[PDB]
Write a structure and sequence with these properties.
heterodimer; A: about 240 residues; mainly beta; Immunoglobulin-like; 2 domains; five-stranded antiparallel sheet; about 5% helix; globular; B: about 200 residues; 1 helix
Chain lengths: ~240, ~200
C-alpha cells in the first residue's frame, strides 16, 4: 500500500547478475536501499534524493543503483556473492521529510553455488480430534509443509474459496529436518481453529496453500527430478459431522 | 553521529501490561529521533520527534523526546499479542539514519482458564500429528531430542469474533516409537494435561 518491491523471495547462483526493483506508489522524492542482517540490523547501501540522482551509503561495495524514474529505485548486484545473501529493504520519504522513511515489504535473497538442492514442499492437512471437539467445542486443523528448500514459502488458509486470517497461527520459524546439515531441508506448520459447529458442517471446505519460491523459466535444470519451479502446493479437507 | 542505545534489550509480558521502552542517543548534529515497529523483517514507521516535551500519541502507543537528557521514551499501554515485535529507535543526523539495535517485545496471552491437552490429529488423505494446546503462556515447549521427531515452538492464535486466544505447538514423526503420549516428553507439561485414548 505504501512502498513495493521485487518478489518477496529470490534464489540465485553465485556469479549471476541480480536485479532488485523497488517501486513506490507514494510520489516520494527520496528512496533508499538497505540490507538487513542478524546482529547488524539495517545498513544503508545507496540512496537517491531525486530522479537520476544517487549517492553511496555505508556499504555500497558490490552494488549498483539506478533511479531512472521517480517511482522506481533499482538495485543491481553485478556478480552475486554468497555474502550478499540477505534481506533487502527499500524505503522512501517525501522531500522535506527525508528521515521519515517508509519501508517496502523487502526481498529475501539467497545466493548459492548451485541450485541442485532446491525442492518444493509436500503439503498435508490434518483434521480435528473428536476429543478436542467434545472437550472444547472447538476444532483445530493443522497444515504441514515439509521437505522444502530454501526456506522461501508463504502459507495461507482458504475456507470455501476465500482466504482467512482469523483463528490462524503459522510458525514464524521453520524446522530444519536435518539440523546437523548445512543444506537441510525445511518444515513448517500452521493451525486454523474454528468452532465445532463450523467444523461439523461437511459443506465447509478447507484448503492449506503453500506458495513456494523456486526457480524461474530461465534457470537451467539437468537433473532427473522435476524442475523445482515457483509453484503452489496444497492439501484440503471438508468438515465432518 | 556515533551511537543510539536502546533499553531494555528484551521484555516478555502478559497482555494488558503497560511497557516502557527507552532510547538514548549520542550523535553530532542531532536533528530528530524516530521510532519503528518491526514485526518481521520490514520496519513500520511510528513516530518522528524533533521538539522536546511534545507527546506523539497513536492510540495505545505514545512517545516523547527529552533533548536535555538525550533520550526518548516509547510507551505502550494495555499491550496486545499483536504488539510483539522488535522496536527500533533511530537518530537522524541531517545525513542518514543511525539505528539502535532494538528492543525485542513479546506479549503473551493471559490464559485465564487453561485446558492443556495433547490431541492426535489424522491426515485428510492417508502420517499423523500431535497437537499440544490450550496451555498457559508460562509453559515452555522444548525442541525434540530425536532428529526424526519434529516439534514446533508455541504459537498464539486469535479467534477474534470469540475474543479467544490460545497457545499450541505441533509434534510429528513417522517413527514407530512415536505417540502423542510421549511426543512432548522433553517438555514440562501440566500434570493434569488431557491425553485422549
Amino acid at each position: 500500500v505504501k512502498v513495493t518491491q521485487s518478489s518477496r523471495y529470490l534464489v540465485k547462483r553465485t556469479g549471476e547478475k541480480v536485479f532488485l526493483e523497488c517501486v513506490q506508489d507514494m510520489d516520494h522524492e527520496n528512496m533508499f536501499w538497505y540490507r538487513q542482517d542478524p546482529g547488524l540490523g539495517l545498513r544503508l547501501i545507496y540512496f537517491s534524493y531525486d530522479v537520476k540522482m544517487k549517492e553511496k551509503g555505508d556499504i555500497p561495495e558490490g552494488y549498483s543503483v539506478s533511479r531512472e524514474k521517480k517511482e522506481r529505485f533499482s538495485l543491481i548486484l553485478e556478480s552475486a556473492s554468497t555474502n550478499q545473501t540477505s534481506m533487502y529493504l527499500c524505503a522512501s520519504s517525501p522531500s522535506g521529510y527525508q528521515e521519515t522513511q517508509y519501508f517496502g515489504p523487502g526481498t529475501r535473497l539467497l545466493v548459492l553455488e548451485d541450485l541442485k538442492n532446491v525442492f518444493p514442499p509436500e503439503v498435508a492437512v490434518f483434521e480435528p480430534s473428536e476429543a478436542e471437539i467434545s472437550h472444547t467445542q472447538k476444532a483445530t486443523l493443522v497444515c504441514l509443509a515439509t521437505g522444502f528448500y530454501p526456506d522461501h514459502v508463504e502459507l495461507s488458509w482458504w475456507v470455501n474459496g476465500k482466504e482467512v486470517h482469523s483463528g490462524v497461527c503459522t510458525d514464524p520459524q521453520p524446522l530444519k529436518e536435518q539440523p546437523a546439515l548445512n543444506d537441510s531441508r525445511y518444515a513448517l506448520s500452521s493451525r486454523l481453529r474454528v468452532s465445532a459447529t463450523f467444523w461439523q458442517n461437511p459443506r465447509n471446505h478447507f484448503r492449506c496453500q503453500v506458495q513456494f519460491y523456486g526457480l524461474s523459466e530461465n534457470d537451467e535444470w539437468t537433473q532427473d527430478r522435476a524442475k523445482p519451479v515457483t509453484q503452489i502446493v496444497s492439501a484440503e479437507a471438508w468438515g465432518r459431522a | 553521529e556515533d551511537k543510539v542505545v536502546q533499553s531494555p534489550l528484551s521484555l516478555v509480558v502478559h497482555e494488558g501490561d503497560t511497557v516502557t521502552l527507552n532510547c538514548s542517543y549520542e550523535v553530532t548534529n542531532f536533528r530528530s529521533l524516530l521510532w519503528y515497529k518491526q514485526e518481521k523483517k520490514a520496519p513500520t514507521f511510528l513516530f518522528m520527534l524533533t521538539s522536546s516535551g511534545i507527546e506523539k500519541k497513536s492510540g495505545r502507543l505514545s512517545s516523547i523526546l527529552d533533548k536535555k537528557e538525550l533520550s526518548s521514551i516509547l510507551n505502550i499501554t494495555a499491550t496486545q499479542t499483536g504488539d510483539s515485535a522488535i522496536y527500533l529507535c533511530a537518530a537522524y543526523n541531517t545525513d542518514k539514519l543511525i539505528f539502535g539495535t532494538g528492543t525485542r517485545l513479546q506479549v503473551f496471552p493471559n490464559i485465564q482458564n487453561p485446558d492443556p491437552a495433547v490431541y492426535q490429529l489424522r491426515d485428510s488423505k492417508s502420517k499423523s500429528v500431535c497437537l499440544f494446546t490450550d496451555f498457559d503462556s508460562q509453559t515452555n515447549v522444548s525442541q525434540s531430542k530425536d532428529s526424526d521427531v519434529y516439534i514446533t515452538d508455541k504459537c498464539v492464535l486469535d479467534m477474534r469474533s470469540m475474543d479467544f486466544k490460545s497457545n499450541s505447538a505441533v509434534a510429528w514423526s513417522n517413527k514407530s516409537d512415536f505417540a502423542c503420549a510421549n511426543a512432548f516428553n522433553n517438555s514440562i507439561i501440566p500434570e493434569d494435561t488431557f491425553f485422549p485414548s
